[model samples]
Each structure stands twice: as C-alpha cells, then as structure tokens.
Target chain A: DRINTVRGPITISEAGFTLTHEHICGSSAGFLRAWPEFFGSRKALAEKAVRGLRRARAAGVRTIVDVSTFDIGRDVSLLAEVSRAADVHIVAATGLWFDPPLSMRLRSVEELTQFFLREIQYGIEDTGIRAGIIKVATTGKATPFQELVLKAAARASLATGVPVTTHTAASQRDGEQQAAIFESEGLSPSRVCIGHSDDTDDLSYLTALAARGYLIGLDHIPHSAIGLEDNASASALLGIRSWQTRALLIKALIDQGYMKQILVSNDWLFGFSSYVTNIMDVMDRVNPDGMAFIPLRVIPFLREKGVPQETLAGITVTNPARFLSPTLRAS
Target chain B: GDRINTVRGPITISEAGFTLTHEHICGSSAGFLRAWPEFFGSRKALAEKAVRGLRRARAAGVRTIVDVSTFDIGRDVSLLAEVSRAADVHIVAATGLWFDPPLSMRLRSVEELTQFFLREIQYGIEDTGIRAGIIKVATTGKATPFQELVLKAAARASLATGVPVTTHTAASQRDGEQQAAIFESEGLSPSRVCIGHSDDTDDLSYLTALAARGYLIGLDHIPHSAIGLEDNASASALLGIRSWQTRALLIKALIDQGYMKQILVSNDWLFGFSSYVTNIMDVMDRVNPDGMAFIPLRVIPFLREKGVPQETLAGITVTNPARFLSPTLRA
Candidate 1:
C-alpha cells in the first residue's frame, strides 16, 4: 500500500534495492524551453543513455531515482522511453532547481505549489507516467527566491504524499537551511532527504543532521569519478582530484549508528551530453562500465573496509525503502 | 622603522590589542548608494548608529577592529573615521574588492588593479588621511579565473606595501587553501594572508591544513547567526547554521592542536546599510541586536567553560592578528 514505482504504485516490499539519486541525461530546461534544439541530437544522447542504464541494470540497480528537476531538464516522456529501453524502473522528479527558468520567478508560490502537486498526483507534461519524488535545489547560498522554491516544494509534498529530495551545495551545508524551511511548513523531517553531503568530511555536522530525523544523501559517492561542480560552466573543466574518502567516511558514520538515516547513491548521470560525455570523455577518465562505480567499486571497497552487511543494506535498500515509501491517507 | 595603518593614523604594532580581525562600520551596494543616496535614513544618522555599535564593541575590551568592507560593498572611510573618533577605538580600513566587484573593476588588468590597491595602502584611501592597513580579496563559490586574478593583484599590493592580505572565502570549497597557494605563488609570505570566514566550516582538518601552511585563520562570523542578511526565510534557515556552541568546539579543537598563533576572531557585523538590498531594519529584526557583544559576552565564556586556556584565548583575540598585520615581518 505504501510504494509507487515507474511501472506503477506497488507494495513497499516490491520497492527493493534503490539508487536514490541518479540522472539519465542532464541539460538546461530554461534554454530547452527557449530553443528546443539547444542540445542537438537528443535522440543520439537518449540512445547512449539507454545503453548506459542497461549496463547499470545488468550491474544490479533496481530502482533509479532520477532527481533532475524542471530547471535541469526533467523530460518524463523521454525518461519513459529510456526506462523501457533499459528495462529498469526510473522514478521521475517534479520541482524547480536553484537556477530556475526566468518565468518561474514571476509565478506565485501558490501557483508553483499547485503545479508540483498536479505533477505528483496526475503526471508531468501530458505523460501518464507520474512523478515519484519532489526535487528542489539551493545553489551555493540559499537566497530568498531559492527559499521560496523550497517552501513551494514543501507545500506540494505536504498536499501530495510524494517524498522530497534535494540538490544542495553540501559544502555550505545548505541542507540544514533547506530542512528549516521544510520543517517550518510542518512537513515531517523524515519525508525529506538532504542530498550531496559527502563533499565534506565533517562528522559533527553530518551526525547532528541525521539526529534531526532527516535522511542524509551521501549521494555523490567517489565524486572524483563524476568530477566536481555540477553547474555547466565548470562541468567540462579537466582536473580531477580524489576529494573525499568515501569508504572511510561511510564506515565512520555507520559505526556512529547513523545507518538508518543514511542513503547512498552515485549521483551518476549516464547521458550528460552537455559536458562530461560530450567533450571530456567521462568513460576514459572514470571506469569503463558507466555508473557501475557504486555497485561494483564503492560497495566492495566499503565491505573490505569492514562495513557490516546489514548496515550496508540499510543504506542501500532499507533506508531508501522507508524514505521513498508512499504516505498514508486519513483512514 | 614603520607602523600599521589605523583610523588614528599609523601606530606601532604593540598598540594593537584584543583585535576583531574582520568587521564593518556600515555598507551598501555601490550602485544602490549612487542611485538612491538616502536608503537608511541619512548619512549622518547611519554614522551615529555605527558609533553606537562601536562604543558597545569598545566596552567589550576590543582595542582594534579591521573594517574589511570593500568599495563595492560601501567602504566609506570618512564615516569610518567619524565612528573611530566617536568610540575612541582604532578602526583599521581595508582596500580591495568583495565578491561582486564591478564589471569595470573585473575587466581591468591585474597590474592596474595592483596599482589601485597600492594607492589605498600607501597614499591613503580617497582624500581622507586614513590609509588602508589591510588588503581584502574574495571568491564566491570556488575560485574563478577572475577571482584568482584578484587574489594575485592583492598579493602584489601586499608585497609592494607591508599591508597584510585578508580574504572572503566560500569556506565550503575550502577556498582558503587556494588563497594560501596563490599567495605563496605570488611570493607573498603565507603569514601575510588572513583567511577570513574559517568559522563557516566545522572541518578542523581543513582549517588546520590552511594553518599548517602558515596562514592566519579568521573565525570571523562569531555568533553563527548571519545577522544582517535581508531575506527572512533565508535568514531563519541560516540561524540553524554554525551555532555558537559548535563554533566554540571548533575553536577549542583548533587550539588543542597548537594553532593558537594562527587564529583570529571577529563578528563580521554590519551595523547598518543605505540600500534596498540590505534592509537594515529587517536585518536588525533577524540579527543579534547588540551585534558585537556575542563574542566577548557569550562565546568566550562558553569556550572558557569548555576548559580552554587563558593564553589560547588571548592569542585568538589579541596577539595573532597583531602579528598578521604588523607593518614589518619579524626580521
């Protein structure tokens, strides 16, 4: 009774192992609205995405939470095709990003709230495939406009029972600020997963955040493989450095009993045609198997680092299940 | 043979005691100030409020304060001199750019920028007799090419004159490390650079990492509440930011690791501003009413309670910044 999937709503048990944060392809929604041909050869990119996700599926990823909000090109129709082609469950996201479309600025919070609510309940952009998660972002520092967007996302999630996730400049700890806005709106803290927290190794900050009853997204596991700075300007820049010790930090948090509140994913975008795949050749830099780094590399690395099996499952499977589980109606 | 610049004119370094390394008298966007000269009542009234705030700070045993506000963000030397005279405290002025330097400023060659900073240091900032004792440089998120250019120019200015360099960092990116690297590359001693806003992160290794490179650390945002930011939603969220309790622990930890000589403290408070951008009244509603009182009145007592030694406390408050700003190196 408490699960929704790309295939359709289902029981919680069926929502098995999930990759809580990933993207099929990344592009600018604002520009796409202005010029539909901005990212030329969309079909080619979609084909590549299909192939990559198929590789990911064979590598053992069950549910893929594609948290690409409207600003970052959330195309549900296209997502549906990729899901069918790859034969994997892809949970679409509905909300705005940090640098949203200019038109969004003129819209009222009530209007945005209704828009997001409709997307979760009905579907996104004329497709029958409904959104399964609410995605929002705070760029570097959370400004008023960004805060307003967060409030609207909270309003929508509260009205609809869909879960909320975020894109945060985790280095600035924008997650805590986002939490304050959501919590102020009377949304349960557990309903929100603060994303991109693995950028910093601050144990104290992470521990306190988990204690506040919110799920923490250690979503950017092995960031160097994906590289840094998600914005388009620095996205293509060459220079990769191994920033965070993913396995050690995860084990430390697990040892501290934060396993139930922790969610793990790669934030892997298989078809980032704009930057990674287009110019830099991401596969040459990272491992060749595409988005399989988490399942194939990091998980084994953490296990070798002596992380317990049940704890690992809690982060990978159980925590995501509890977090992404559908909400109950007033019985 | 030389002396550090202050509002009262150049004084021997020994005269600097219990210094607040980063702060402001009053500030506004330069464009806003030019378009609407009267934003926060009038200039006279703004000066009075600044004097009142400084008097409270002086009462808290603060002998000297570095007014690190840059020209883009309302660096008014005449009003600052007036406040210093009214409160009977040394106000050391800074010369450089904050995050959003004007297009014209950004477009200028590094040599030209270096010359501009040199004039403010050696001759005096504007027609006022008060010269800038410190050089300020900043980067918003990560160091952009322009930001690295500005940092290089600031280094040239620091070496040309004996004035020390202070910085505004997006601490999440650990831009302080970049600042140190640039300063070293530009041939300026690491001791000449004070990495401001180090308190924004609880990452001890990041702070200590910069300190080990011999740079001074500015624990500037002492109270943890970013008091003067306008947006109520954003401000409220920031209130859950670095708590005084968390900041105290970080300070104690840094001191425990023998970094006392490299630590400095301040509030980074802006008393008032003449701009629509920073609604001073609204900011006051969100901030500590007695802005400068938090560090001396609250944080020090908390640190003392946590078993911090008296000497470590004095080095952070007094000795470190004096050494950092001393007119001549300890030759």
Candidate 2:
C-alpha cells in the first residue's frame, strides 16, 4: 500500500496481490537540492519514480506502494507513471515521517488532514491514481509531532476509508505511543500497520502493539559481510544481540494470537541514487554499533522456528491487501 | 585532612536541607539553563521558577539549601537570599566561573579573578548586593592553568572570608586528575572540595582514585547512571542495576568499607524538563519523552531501606552538609 500518497478510495480486482511497503524512486534531498519550489508537482515526481517500477514488474510484484511522502519529498505524479509502466497497481499516500528539520511543516493537523483526504479524492477521481493507505511516523520525542501525524493520518483514513501504515522510529515503546495517538483520534486499531519494531528491547511491547490491531514491521536486513562496529573501549556493546532477540519479539507477537499483525520485508533498496548514503547516515546516528548482519540471521531463524507458511503469507500478502483495497479503505 | 575521610564524597540533592551542603537552591545555569547560549536577557520566569522552587523546598521539610550556582547569574546571592527569605530556607550561595567561560578563560588574569571574587566575598556582588558562601573554582578534564590560578585566588580569599573552598570538577573520568593537579598547585587540601557527579563516569578506578585523594565522590544517581544511547552505547546488561536491589547493594558495599563519612546521596532530579518525567503517571499520561532513562520514584524509598546504614545516610543527608555549608549561611 502506498501509505504516503493516497488520494481517495479505490478498487481491488480478483487478481489481487499487493506489496504493502516500499520506497518510490527519488527523495526529498533531490527536492531540497534542485526544485525547492515545486511541491506536489506530479510531473516532477513521476519522472523520478520510474526506474524502480521496472524492477518491481520483473519481480512478479503486481501492486506497489511508493511510500515517499511529506517530510521527505513526495510527488504523486511519479507514482501514476510507475503504476502505468510496471502495470503494477501503484498507490500513493499522504503523510509524514519522523522529524528531521522543520522546513516541511505543511499546516495545522486539521489542515493536513483536509489536504490528505482531498488529495486522495483528486488522485482517485481525476488522476486515476487511487490511494491505498495512510502513512505516519513518530518522531524522536513523544512530542506534539506524534499527535499531529497520527491525527492527520487517521482523519484521512476516515475521509476516504483506507488503512494506515506508520514508519515507527527505532525507539522503545514509541509504537505504543503511536498506537495510542491513532486510538485517541478514534481510528480503528485494526487498520493500522506499524513500521520498525526492531529498535526496542521490550518484546512485550510488540505484543501490546499487535493486540492494539497494528501490524508489526521488521523490514530492515543488514549485511552479513561486516560485523558490528568494534569499539572495544565501549563496555555496553558486548552482550547485545538484536537479530534473534527481535525475532523472538515477533514470535511473542504470534503467541498473542496476533500473527496477522506481523509483516517482514527487507526495507532495503540500493542503486541509482545516493539514498543509501542518507539511509546509512541515519542508521549510524541511530544505531552506530548495530551490526550489519542481523536481519539475514533473523529471517532464517523465523522460518526454522515453525511459523506457519500461510501466516507468513498473510503478513506478506493478504494483510497488506486489506490495507490497499480502496473499497474498504481504512477506518 | 583529605586522608581522614575514606573514599570520601558529598552528593547533591535537589534541595539540600538540614545541614544543606549541596543543592542548587537558586540556579546552576546561573541564568544559563533557560538563557543558555543566548546569554544576558530578562529571565523573569526563571527567577519566578527559582522563587517557586525555594517555596516548594520550604514545604518539603527543608530549612536550608546551598545554591550551587557558580557562574554569572550565580553572583546574585541576593536573589538566593530572596528565595531563602521567602521560603525560610537558609541560603548558602556561591561565586565562581564555569570551567570554560567569561572568567579568566579569556585570560583575564588571576588578579582579575581575585578582584571579581573579592567583590562578592568582601563587599558583596555588583552594586545590588549578595555575598557568597563557599569559594567556587571550576576545573577541566585536568586543571587548566586558568583553574589553578582561580583555586589559588579562592584559597587566598578563603583566608579573608572564611568560606571553605569547593572545586567544581568536570564529571569526565579525568576530573580526579584535574582536581588533584589543581589542589597541588594551590597547596590546598582536597578534603575541602565536594566533587559533583563524580559517579557519572564508569571507571571505578577514577572514583576510587578520587576518593583516595581525600576528595568526595558523590554517589548520586546511584540509580540508572546514564551510560549513553543504547544504539550508540555498549552492552550494560550485567551492570544496569537490573533491580533496585542491585543499586542498594552497590551503595552498601561502598559503606561497608568505612566510606560512610565520604558518602552522600540524592535524587539528583532535574525537574520541569525533558529528562525528569515528573511522576509515574507522567509516563502513563505520555507527557514525558520515551528515551529518557528514569528510575521509578520508588527508587528513593528503596535506597532509604536498603542503602547505607541510617547513620551514614544521615551523614550524607544531614551531617556533612552542615560542615560544608556552615562556613556560609549565618542566618
């Protein structure tokens, strides 16, 4: 589901298959560097998001959600082209990620909500680019930013009726805070998908999140070639084990009878642009000592542990379909 | 004198009472916390906050507070006296420059520091009036040439004002080295200084060495003693004071070695800010940020029961404060 650029309601064909979360081509850095003035310019964004769609089609991925939106540069027009070129259902969204700089602040929460719902309508009615999901993120602090993002996202979901997916920052229990924000906004928890549950140690937190009706995303796969950054002087790094530990959190999520609330993907994309550089910089700042080999180890562990195939399939498939089928939309 | 106090240290509570040795009754930012790098501006609200803080102190079974404000705004001992009068908490204020700042940092000369201190020590500060309590001299990672001169001047002035000297050492592990060097330069005794936040550094060698020098290693924040960001920090699983029980065990160990006279404890709580989550419900209400490492309020109660024997606790909480601060507040 293209949680970041949804314009309105849409249709689901019987031939349905949807890859719930993926980044579109191009980024906000390009906007800041080149087109400082052209916001929401469909022509500009369409030109940028094309290259990735070619690969998406070849991979047998039928529907694509290009999730670049608000705080980052998001162009809806590129999504339309990507949808056409790949013959992959390209859904767009309207929302934001964690706080970086404040230049991207659009308006009040209510104003942003109105903007998202209207854009969803415009994409569906005029552009034929239907919206699939609502995107949101919790910034570093439990500040007003969380409230603004969740409320705006839920309002749009309410307006057009689409599911919500949020980029959960790598923090402890912030997913619960994010869920609480959505819940307070009167959004049905069932329609929400939470991104990035790997950063926290509280496995029970994941259970709490799944019970709240949000899908947990463990999409980051680090490389196997390099071990953790070894700074022997640091005493705190010796015992930390994130990969299997987090895999166990996912297992606990299943035990809570909320397996439908789990999705796994390699939130990895490389080539073409220097987005990898920016992404790596973020990883360094957030988890400098985080080993590169974690996720590769985790997926194999998850499979061997007897997680049912259909359950994994649902997380990778049907659940995301529920998010993208514009007819039902999200609560 | 330094040799007499074993593993000696004095810690700072939020409001030092009874003997009231260590506390920032007036300010620490000394108009800096709020004013910050902005420098010199009307802080009507900050002053009001201090007034309110002092009144709050009076309500909390406190009769005295040593305002450890050592920079520019700290020179205003009158404001401290104002808070003291309003709250009926005896105020023992201070005079000193920051480890790096407007004092001799710009090479204003030891005589200049002497003159600046003389005004507060003898005649009272500025034209407005406010005398200092303990002489304050700040040191860097090690004592800089500038800090040595200030210590010398402080030692010289102590002969005149009878104010005991307290050196503000950087909490970096190198603070003990710096303070030892400064004390050597001034031929001053380390016993006179109450080192602050000496417990922040992980090297027990540093703490042990500082204590051996007859200086105080304030075991404040014996609670979570912040290591660093989990992503950026090393593994501290075995050392995380996994339970409050462990915290008491550490303090008890220190006391069993006859280091009681040197010990002091406090909440070291910074309030009305991001780090202090205020109360437990603040966590529930989502008012506090997520990443801050807070020991629950029950920690103090736990310390009361399980930490040092009652006599040692009183020496830390009551007796040593009377000794350190009695040199200042006559009222």
Candidate 3:
C-alpha cells in the first residue's frame, strides 16, 4: 500500500519511524504574504525547518505528518523543499483547524466535503502537492459549524480511502463525540486516529477509544506546561499531564493490549510567524529537541519502564504506516 | 487637502469632527435583512430608528460615524446613506469581512480577496457608488485562516487604495497583537490601523504595545451590558456610570502614558438586530441609554472627573479619528 506525501507517493515500508502529528511552521493564515521578510525567504524558512527534520532523521524518524492546515500557515511548497533537503517523507493535511472563519461556517457539509476532496484529489492550490491525510478539529464540543466540517472530513476520507486524524480537546472528552460523528458517517474506526488523547490523564477515555479500534495519539510528548498556571484559560491547561504521567498512561495502554493502537509525537513546530509572540522560544525552552524529543527522550523512558524496542517500533512505525496507507473500499 | 470616503461621498479630514470610531447602524446574519426584513422591524422602521440615533449622537457633538458592519454581518450601505442624509452626519462604511467569512470568501486566495476589497473601496459597494472610508476585519479569540486572509487582504487593499484599516478583536485574547503583526508584515504603517473593542480588557500592557506601534486603540464597546449594573441600587448610584467606569479608567491610563494621539473612542453601538426581534430598539435603549452618544455624553464627563484633560478627550474623540481616517491614497 502507498500513501500520498508532499513529494508524491511512497510505500508503507518506506514510512519508517513516523511522527504522526507535528508541524514545520504554524502562523496566522496569510503570514507569508503579510510578513514575507519575517521568513527571510521560503528557502530560508525551509532551511530552518530542515534543521529539525535532519535531527529527527538522525534519531531514526523517517516520516512526519505536518498537521498544520492552511489557516495555521501550512506551506506545501516549503514542506516539499524541506522533505527533499532533509531526505524525509512529509505528509501534508487537508481540512480546517478549530478556528474556522464565519465564511466557512456558512458552507454546507457537502460543500466543505468537496473543498477537502479538491485538495486530496487534485492539489493544494496550484502546488500539485496532494494531502495524504484529512485533519479536522473541535474544542470542548463541536459547534454546528465544526460539526459540519467534521462530517465533511468523514465524507472526504470515505471517498478517498484515506485515514482521518483529529485535534480533540481531550480534557472535554470530545474525542468520543468526534468518533461518534465519524461512525455515523460510516467511516470505519480503524481508519481514524483520535489525536491529542494524552492531553488528559483519563485512561478510561483513551482505553475506550482504543478499544473501539481507534488509534490513540499520545502526541504532545514531554508534556510542556505552557499555560497551565492560568486556570482562567482552558486551552493553556490542555497538556496538563506531566511527561511522567503520559509515559505511565502509554505503559498502561500497552498492558491493556493496545500497543498497536498507540502513536506518539512531540507536536512541536519548527517555527512560526512572529505574530504568535515568543511561542517557539517557549516551546524550545520546554522541549529543546523539538521533533526529536520523542525519539531521543520519551522512547528511552518507555524502554526503562520495561517496554521492548520492537513494541516501540510497532507503535511508531508499523502502526502509522497501516493507518496512513489508503484502504480503497471494495467496490 | 486630505480627505476620507463616506456614504455621502468624499469629505475633508477637517469636516469630520468628534467621530465615533466603531458603531453599527444595522447588523444581523448575512441575508437576514433581505430574507426576513420584518425580523429587523422592516427596512423603513430600521432606517427611521437609525436616523433618530444618529441625530441624538450628532446633537452630542458627533459629526462622523464609522459603521464597521461587513456584508456577512448584514451591512446595508443604502440604509447608511439614507440615515446619513436624514441625520445630516457623515457616515463611513467598511470594505472588509467580519469574524466569520462565507464559503465564497473562504475559498479565495488572499490576492483574490484583496481585489474584492479594492473594488468595494475604489469603485463602490454593490452598484451604490458609496465607497468605503475604512477597511474593517475581525478576529475573535484567535484568528482563523480565513480571518488571516481577510487581514492580509485588508492590508493589501489599504496599500493599494490608501484607506486605513480597523479591526474587531477579542481583547482578552490579545488578538490585536497578531492583527497588528500581520499588517506590519505587509509593510503597513501602524498609524493606519485602529484596534477595536480594546475596552473589553483592562490589560494596559496589551493596549500600550499596540499604541506604541502607532496603531489607534479603539476604546469602544462602552456602556455594554458586560459591565452594566446588576441591581437597581447600583444603576441609581451614579446614573449607570458604574457600568463603564473601568473603560474610563482604561482611557485615562492610556492618556497618562502619553498615547493621547493614538486613541479613538466609540460606543460600538448596534442600532438593531433580528435576535432582539421587535424589542431590538427598546432593548438597545434599556441597555445603552445614551446610544452612540455614550462616550461623549457620559464617559467623557466621567473621565474629566478622573483628571483626564479636556484636550486629551478631544484628541480621542475628534483629532485622532480625523488623522486615522484621513487617507494616504497610493497608486
């Protein structure tokens, strides 16, 4: 089976140790046009992104799913350049993030479905770089607009036989709602990966999703306490679990025979536009290795906790490959 | 010699006296006014009510109004022209999208969106030939991708046409910083931007950062229900002065910090909406008794008592808006 990537098709075996959810760049939509100088040049930004991918590659990471949607400043051309320069496969996403504009809200579910399908089937804009995965997000609960986007994502995934990944507010246990919506759309649970599942320490929720054949994204490894102190802001407290707690949660899931259902990544960005205000600096302070943090740190922690190397490979490599490979439904 | 566009046509900067920076003549979901005119008590009654509000505001020394409603928010340029003529006050319409963009807008590139705005600013809105004086864009909580597109488009349109840009921000989220960054990246002068809804947060540091960059700080949203009296006793205590006392303090603090030249103030008053149904006028009256005159009629006097000089107040209400709205028209 093959998966689409920024540089075109690649075999499942070639995916290697995959970081299923991470970003090369994140910015307000249209950051490139607004502040082209901030990036210096596209190549300059790609070079900076290359540094992280190179480091990850050296640590045995071969493929990375860049989950940044266009709104979050996803630049497919830059991703293709970074992939070539770093000699790594890059899977770009098609869909909207949590903060969809009002214009998007007015779009019907069928209209949004075609919108996502265009990126999946044709190319993103004129770049001719097809998206390998469908990414959709929701906050505490899905707004009517968000629900529409989610349904569109499910239809697009079903049409193309690609897997769907999500940005779930685990603290709200909304992944259950996302899964229910996907299920209602007749999308198989095996074709879905519920992301940010490690944001909370709710083992029951994680186990329940995984038990139902869904992939659990133990993303946000190293568990940075970015805004946990501000109880007034719920989003800041998303990665509330300590890294130690996250590893324990992974181990507990593994014990429950859900190892193959687990995927892990750092969820770090290579860089972002300056509008975000010292966010990269803060992320660097929390996880110095960036994308290499899981491969260099968390896996070692898991091994120390009596998890074998082969199990880690299955979780990081074989699992993502199977999930990402297109499953062309029998016609 | 400097001039700004308004519903009544071009007016010299000197002609615009004591302007209210952000207010709504009429607003509702897109197509609601046309699809269900009765929801807003019919177009005739809506126009009459708006004219009365403008007349009262004009009597309180307001000579100009920047109506920040976009097409998605049911902007009626004809109605604005009617009310402007009836009340004998200058009314400036906006040429940017609100927080939510429609599907047609969401699907367009920034360049495409920029041309859309340029047509509205340069030619006129929907065959009305009533050119917009300002470009209005919005960001809630955080900017969505489409919101960023609108921001960049507004910046490009401003660069092409020389009109200034204003924004609706979720002040608590400090959304103005990102909006400013986008405009700054587009090589726009901060002087040409006004960050609206700043009164929502008492975060002096946030407002200071924007003002220091030369952006006009809109101390709008005054006398809002968010700060309104909870009981009859509190309402009678200072004649509803307690509702917006914090906003007055914010204005005073900005003046003390020597940002008097960068201040713009308004009521962010909405004349009517379908959500309020038949009682929209009465509800607005009960909630905001002073209407568009709230700042000049009530808040300025409160500021005077708090030691804010009359000259500083004039700059906020008069001189500042003139300079901000005065076009720097480029080729």
Candidate 4:
C-alpha cells in the first residue's frame, strides 16, 4: 500500500521512523500574505525546515506527518519544496484545527466533507500536492462547530480511504469524545489517531482509547514546556503531568502490550509566527532540538528504561505506516 | 467633501450630529444567523429591542451610530438599515474582517483583500447598494499574521477609497501600537485609524501614545457589560462601577492631555447573542439599564460631575466621529 506525501506517493515500507504529529510552520491564517518578512522569504523558511528534517533524517527519522492544517498556516508548496530538498517524506494534512475560520464555520457538514475530499483526492489549492491525513480538533468538550468539523473529517476519511488524526485537550480526555463522534459517523477507531495524549498521564484514558483500536499520540515529548505553558491555567487548575511522568507512562503502556497502538513525536514547529510574536524563537528557547527531540532525547530515555528496540520501532515505524496506508473499507 | 456613508445613504458631516463610534444592533457567530436563524432568539423581538435602545439614545440627543459588526459577527446591513429608519438614527456600517479570517479570506492576498473592502465601500455590500463608511479590523494581544493581513487590507483599502479604519483591540496588550505600525508601514496616516476598545485598560500611557500618534481612541465599552461582565449580579455591579470610574478617569486624562478631539465614546452594545440563554433585555436592564443611551445620559452626566466641559463631551460624542468617519476616498 502507498502513503501520500507532499512530493507524491510512497510505499508504506518507505515511510520509515515516522513522526506522526508535527508542524513545519504555524501562524494565524493569512499572516504570511501580509507580512512575509516576519517569516523571512518562503525560500528561507523552506530552507530552515529542510535543515530541521535533515538533522532528523541523520537521527534515523525518515517520514514526518505535518498536522498543521489550514488554520495553522499549512503550506503544501513549501512542504513539497522542503521534502524534495531534505529528501525526507513529508505528509501534509487536510483538515481544520481547533478554531476553524469563518468560511468553514459557514459551510455545511457535507460542504466541509467535500473540501477535505478535494484536498486528499485532487490537491491542496493549486499545488496538486495531496494531503495524507485528515486532521480535526476539539478543546475540552466539542462545541457545535467543532462537532461539525469532526463529523466532516469522518465522512471525508471514510469516503477517500484516508486516515484521520486529531488535536485533543487531553486533560479533559477530549479524544474519547472525538472517537465517539467519528464512530457515530461510521469510521473505524483504527483509522483515527487521537493526538496530544501525553498532556496528561491518565493511563486509563490513554489505554482505554488504545484498547478501542485508536492510536494514542505521545507527540508532545520534548516540547511539554510549550504545552504546559500554553495550558498554564488548565495545568494549575486541573494538575498536568510533567514530561518525565508522561515518559514513565509510556514505559508502562509498552509494558502493557500497547506499543503497536502508540505514536511518538515532538509537535515542534520549524518556523512559526503568531501575530507579532516569533514563535520559532520561543520554541528554540524551549526545544532547541526541534523534531530531533524524539530521536535524541525520547528514544534514548525509553531505551534506558528497558523498552525493547523492536517495540520502539513498532511505535515509530510499523504503526504509523499501517495507520497512514490508504485502505478501502466497506462503509 | 466631508460626507460619510450611512446605511440610508451618504450624509454630510454636519448632519451626523452626536455619534456613537462603535456598537452592534444585533449579532451572532458566523453563519448562525443564516444556518440557525433562531440562534439569537426572535429576530422581530431583537429588532424591536434595538430600535427601542436607539430611540432612547435619540431622546438623549444622539443622532448617528457606527455599527461595527462585520460579516463574521453577523453584520446584516438590511437589518441595520431597518433599525436606522425605525429609530431615525443615521447608522454607518463597516467593511473588514474581525480577528479570525475565514479560509477563503486567508487564501486571498493583501491586494485581493483590499479589493474586497473597496468593493463594499465603492459599490455596496452584497447587492444591498448600501455602502460601508468605515473599515473595521481587530487584534487581540497582537496581530497574528492573518490579522496583520487584515490590518494591511484595511489600510490599503482606506488609502484607496478614503474610508477610515477602526479596530478591536486587547487594550491591556497595547495591540494598537502594532496595528498603528502596520498602517503606518502601509503609508496610512494615523489620523485614518481609530484604535478601539482603548478604555479596556486603565493604562493612560497606552491611550495617550496612540492619541499622540494622531489615531482616534475608542472609549466604546461603557458600563463594561457591553463587552462582557460577570454572571454574579454583585460582581457585575462592582465591575461595572470600577470600569466606569476608570473610564471616566481615562476620559479626563485624555482631555487633560489636549487629545479630546481624538476620543469617541459608545456602549458597544449587542442587542442579542447566540450563546446566551437569558433574555438579553433582562440582562441589559440588570447590568446596563441605559442601553445605547448609557454614554449620553449616564456617562456624560457622570463626566460633568467630574468637571469635564460639555464642549469636550460634544467633541468626543459628535465632532470626533464625524471627522474620523468622513470619507476621503482618493479613488
């Protein structure tokens, strides 16, 4: 089976050591058009992304699933350019993030489904670069708008044979609610990857979703500082687990034979501008290694904790390959 | 030479009379008005409430109001025109995006966005033949890349068509500074922009700076609840008292600095909301009894008690808005 990448299709076997959830760049929608200088030139931004992916490539990473979506300023042409330059498979996503723009909010569920299908089947914008996954998100409980996006993502995924991934407020165990919506739309849990699960160390929450055939994303790895800071109020209010605590939870999950249901990565941004803030600078201060954090920091820590090498490979390679491979299922 | 476009048609600046620079007759989330018309309760009842409020304001010597609600915030020019005709108040409408640009808007270049705004200003909004008098853009904390695009669009459109720009700002963050910088960068004179929500903070320095730079200041959140207030009656009352007191001081300080000509005041009142379950009328009575008349009856009287001259109040309430909104359409 072949997986879609920004540069085109690749056999599932070629999608090795995959980082399931990450962003090349992030900005408020339409930011780049107004101030391209903030991100420098597109060529410079692409070069920066290329360097990050090349470093990751040297550390045994071969594929990256960019989960930015349109709201996060997903740039398929840039992704395509970077993938070719870095010689690493970069999979772009077609979906909406937590807060969709007014355009998507105005669209009917069927209309939104068609939008996602177009990106997956045809291409994103005029780039002719197909997206590999459908991404949707919810914060805490899903608002009516968020639920619409989730349903649309499910319909699109089912129709196109593409897999779905999600952004969830893990402390609220939002993934289970997302899973329920997808299931209601007749999408198999196996086709959905519940993301940001590491934000909380609620083993029951993680294992329960995993037991239902959903892939649990421990994607915040080395960048827990950013997430914790972003959710500082929620952290203080609900009591967030530290990255170290989440690392130990990973070992526990592996020990419980859920390795195949796991995916790990740093949800790092290679270049990011949020309004007036250069988010890439903040990320550099918090996570200097960027995407290499998973291989350099996480894998080594897991190795020292007595996690089997093959189990780690199953999470970083075998699982994502299977999850991302397009499979025609009877609806 | 000095006329502003109101929903009813163009009116000479002298005829604008006492103007409130920012308000909403009624509003809801994007598409809620069309997709779920009942989102804000009965439209007839809502219109009645709005007309009643405007009539009260008219009785309090108000004659014109700038309805700053954009498309994302359920701007209905038809309803605005009806409210204006019923209330006998000249209502100026806005053309521009809020902080969140939809995907279709995000995809457009700055030039494209400029054309979009120009079309509304020159031709009219959505075939209603009612031209927009002002451009309204927004920023919270800072301009996200998309917001920057919008700010640029507002500036470019303002430069192209001569309609003044207004903004929604997170005052505590001093977002107006970045907004001014971008407008200045786009060759827009600071006099062409009104930095809105300037009274949300007690920080006189921020307001003073923007005013000193020749931008109009929007002290538009009268009685606090017009923006949003606490649910508890006691808490709301306390916050309301504190907000007005601080706003009174802000007004006094700006006038003290000889910047009275740059200040504009209003209630920023919304007649209804899709998210609220309580009767909007009851909430308004409990939280802000005067409605749109709050600024004219309560605020101005309170300011008089604080020793502000009637002439200064007239400048803030009448002359400033007329000067700020008067079309300079170069094209």
Model 4 bad stretches (over 4 Å): A226-241, B1-331
From the highest lDDT down, the ranking of the candidates is 3, 4, 1, 2
Q: Give me the displacement of residue A167 in model 3, in angstroms.
A: 1.1
Task: Estimate TM-scores for all models.
Answer: 0.49, 0.41, 0.56, 0.57
Over the stretch B196-285, how does candidate 2's per-residue lDDT look in tens digits? 655455555666666677766555434442233243221232124233355445455556655666654443332222111112222221
- Best-fitting candidate, measured by TM-score? 4
Query: What lDDT tens digits, residue by residue, belong to model 3 across residues B1-331?
Result: 2888999999988899889989889866444454335445567888898888899999998999999887656677888898999999999998888854534456557987787788788888866788888999999877888888889999999998888999988888999999988898898888889999898887899999888878889888777653344454433432333347777688889898989998888887877764223343555578778899888889989999988888877878888888888888543
Count of backbone clashes for each model? 0, 27, 6, 5
Model 3 chain A, TM-score vs. native: 0.94
lDDT of 4 by residue, B89-118 (tens): 999998898865544555556876787788
- Tell me how many residue pairs clash in candidate 4: 5
- In candidate 3, stretches whose alpha carbon ends up further than 4 angstroms from where it belongs are A37-44, A226-240, A273-276, B1-331
Docking band of candidate 4: incorrect
Candidate 1 stretches with Cα past 4 Å from truth are A1-331, B31-37, B226-231, B236-240, B274-281, B284-286, B329-331
Worst 10 residues of 2 chain B by lDDT: B1-10
| Interface RMS deviation of candidate 3 | 11.6
On a 0 to 100 scale, what is the lDDT of residue A34 in model 3?
30
Candidate 1 local lDDT, residue A277: 22
